[PDB]
Amino acid sequence: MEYVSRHAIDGKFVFVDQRATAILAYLPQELLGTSCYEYFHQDDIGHLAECHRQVLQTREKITTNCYKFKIKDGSFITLRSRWFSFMNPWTKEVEYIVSTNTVV
């Protein structure tokens, strides 16, 4: 049903939990360090980038629209994600975003 990923503030995968493989067929090392945008269907990039701009400016859960994500075999699956951007309480800077990614 769902898996969790962590992203740098630019959208790069920096952590992928073990549930990702059963869902996307990628092992973690095929995603880590790559840009989330490389996997989006080009019809979804616009609204996903809009959520990107918004999750960086608030601590409230951002929920994406549905969007398509390219899996290892080239096909696309439909996801919906819940994002929380975490701010270092000391430095006051956002160090990563935690994305819970739900199938269809």
Ligand SMILES: CCc1ccc(OC[C@@H](F)CO)c2occc12
């Ligand atoms: C850096 C904020 C962020 C987190 C997660 C994203 O997508 C997750 C998918 F790649 C997994 O299905 C994002 O997309 C654009 C910005 C973005």
